[PDB]
């Protein structure tokens, strides 16, 4: 009531874009949207679709 805590539902591979690194901008906009409300919590669904482990390359 006094501090409405917001939510941001974000999936894994939607952030990972084509181009080159505009996937970075897809979360730059999200993070600057994290500062329009203060009580802001970020959800990254399927984070392994963004940052998986080094296998051989």
């Amino acid at each position: 009531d006094e501090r409405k805590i917001t939510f941001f539902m974000r999936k894994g591979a939607d952030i990972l874009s084509k181009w080159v690194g505009e996937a970075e901008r897809q979360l730059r906009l999200l993070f600057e949207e994290a500062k329009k409300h203060q009580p802001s919590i970020i959800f990254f669904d399927e984070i392994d679709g963004l940052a998986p482990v080094r296998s051989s390359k």
Partner: protein, 197 residues
């Protein structure tokens, strides 16, 4: 009368009814047995290479259209063409750079139409020519603006860079190196031809 175009666009298809400040490639035609056999192989290999340039335009348009209809602000130089109109016959012409007096900045600015109008005529012997246009887009990014516009136009420059990375392939690279030596000999013979004629 003639178009007041400053960039060196011209080739076997057209675009030769132009006049600029720096070097311009206006070429359909402008001992003896070596000259005539040179002309014969010039006609033949130039027809083949113009077919190759048309194929290059065909495989470039699929991305060029997206990169032309995505953004429009960089499809027009920040400095209006009229300020460069009066120097054809504030702004002063260097070797190729135009210098302004108020600030003193150098701009190699285009309007993003020049690559496809260049391949309309066709002298892109090498995907290095597209690399030059992409680096020159990066140059327009660098010359004018603050950090935000510079970084966004650099992202676009990197987009054209990935595109040319896919366009540039080793077999096309070797074919284009062969035609690159061919057309360096061609441009040498053409400059000596316009100097002697």
């Amino acid at each position: 009368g003639p178009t007041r175009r400053l960039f060196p666009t011209g080739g076997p298809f057209g675009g030769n009814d132009v006049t600029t400040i720096f070097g311009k490639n206006t070429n359909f035609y402008n001992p003896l047995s070596e000259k005539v056999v040179l002309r014969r192989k010039l006609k033949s290999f130039q027809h083949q290479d113009m077919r190759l340039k048309n194929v290059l335009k065909i495989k470039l348009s699929g991305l060029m259209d997206l990169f032309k209809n995505r953004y429009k602000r960089f499809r027009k130089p920040p400095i209006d063409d009229a300020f460069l109109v009066h120097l054809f016959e504030a702004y002063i012409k260097d070797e190729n750079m135009i210098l302004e007096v108020s600030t003193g900045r150098k701009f190699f600015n285009m309007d993003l139409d020049i690559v496809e109008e260049r391949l309309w005529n066709g002298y892109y012997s090498e995907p290095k020519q597209f690399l030059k246009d992409i680096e020159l887009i990066y140059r327009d990014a660098n010359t004018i603006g603050d950090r935000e516009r510079v970084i966004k136009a650099s992202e676009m420059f990197a987009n054209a860079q990935m595109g040319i990375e896919e366009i540039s392939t080793p077999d096309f690279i070797q074919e284009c190196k062969a035609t690159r030596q061919r057309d360096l000999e061609r441009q040498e013979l053409f400059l000596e031809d316009e100097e002697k004629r």
